[PDB]
Design a protein around this ligand. Structure first.
Ligand SMILES: [Br-]
Ligand SMILES: [Br-]
Ligand SMILES: [Br-]
Ligand SMILES: [Br-]
Ligand SMILES: [Br-]
Lengths: 245, 244
């Protein structure tokens, strides 16, 4: 009651079960109240990695670098380690498969000056694009906490970012991850591997009939083996909190 | 090859559930249709709640609905469907098929503009004869499964004459089911006021590299079988390997 952030260390049981470490942050939009298993880690800023595809998508769409969610981004012919990257993509499949090369091309066309202005307008993380214009979210200066992800996501949900309503609608479509008669999840995965420590991200929100629960989680990810725990652990927390059955 | 093919093997899914109806599929990439029954595929019925798709579009385009957040206050009349007896926005009104909300939309739209819009949409028989607030339940309007797919394909491609925004919002409102394999945007219907009593499910399956449009209706003598609209459609999508 009235508390801004409440710590619930019982969620650590979900991390410990999988011999892992991290944070889940929830925000109840109706009550304007946050919950986390770790207040400190909740506010620790990391590389966004592929969670950066949300603001990158928005900026690309607003500037006309991406025409719409149907525009085809031709594979450059370089065979990369992730099979799904080695084919043509539109914004939907690029987001779904986390296709870095497509987004690196977006970033180059956006350019450092306009990328910087946009991240300042978005109040995104530390607003620092230092490093390579086409890799800064992977190994440059930009850093964002789970609680800063939620602030940015809430603005996207309410179409309050200083880009077009259309841009915001298309990205929220592109974020669609799961839906049934109980809930809808719009979300984006990330895996930061270029700079220690290696972490997994899942950020987004749960739409219910009468409420929205924003979430941002990150966890230590020494190998790709555990990538599935990003979603599995978040769902164990959403279930415990009765947000999803 | 052929624009339309009959696949009578799907009748086994209707037989299995002691039911009678049609499933119509359209492969958008191949521009080819498939159905278990070409005759029934082209029989026109009352749209009932499948009309909530064009109604939503017209309401949004004319500013009768501001956005998918605008709250439509319950009028205080207790109706038979529990979920109708509460406040709604466009998302929840579509999800729970809340007729009274849509009846109010229709009254604000009015006969003249509703008629012009259905003509522009080439929607079914374009006939709004009866009450402006109930014509899709017991008035003149009729649409076949094959005509549902024509209309849906225009909505998918933002080719209806209404604003792109209108089309985007309704497609959001249609969202039914999503996972790593597919997305379903769809609308249920149950026509009971004129025989024959039928269940509808119309919409599409979005895959990575294709869209499958679908329109199914089936005889629905009682509400007991409403679950078969989705179950029978899914038996067909799985047989055709469209969803795992
Ligand atoms: Br829009
Ligand atoms: Br990822
Ligand atoms: Br008016
Ligand atoms: Br959507
Ligand atoms: Br219905």
């Amino acid at each position: 009651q009235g508390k801004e952030w409440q710590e619930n260390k019982s969620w650590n049981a979900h991390f410990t079960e999988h011999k892992s470490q991290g944070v889940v942050v929830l925000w109840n939009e109706n009550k304007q109240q946050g919950f986390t298993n770790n207040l400190k880690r909740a506010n620790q800023a990391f590389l966004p990695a592929s969670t950066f595809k949300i603001p990158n998508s928005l900026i690309a769409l607003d500037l006309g670098v991406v025409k719409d969610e149907h525009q085809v981004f031709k594979w450059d012919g370089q065979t990369r380690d992730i099979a799904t990257w080695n084919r043509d993509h539109n914004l939907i499949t690029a987001m779904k498969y986390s296709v870095v090369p497509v987004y690196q091309e977006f970033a180059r066309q956006i350019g450092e000056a306009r990328m910087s202005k946009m991240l300042h307008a978005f109040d995104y993380g530390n607003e620092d694009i230092s490093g390579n214009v086409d890799s800064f979210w992977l190994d440059g200066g930009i850093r964002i906490s789970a609680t800063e992800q939620i602030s940015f996501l809430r603005k996207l949900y309410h179409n309050k970012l200083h880009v077009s309503e259309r841009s915001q609608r298309i990205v929220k479509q592109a974020m669609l991850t799961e839906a049934n008669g109980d809930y809808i999840i719009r979300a984006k995965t990330g895996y930061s591997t270029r700079i220690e420590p290696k972490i997994g991200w899942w950020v987004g929100w749960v739409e219910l009939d009468d409420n929205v629960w924003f979430f941002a989680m990150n966890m230590d990810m020494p190998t790709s083996d555990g990538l599935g725990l990003r979603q599995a652990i978040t769902k164990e927390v959403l279930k415990q909190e009765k947000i999803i059955p």
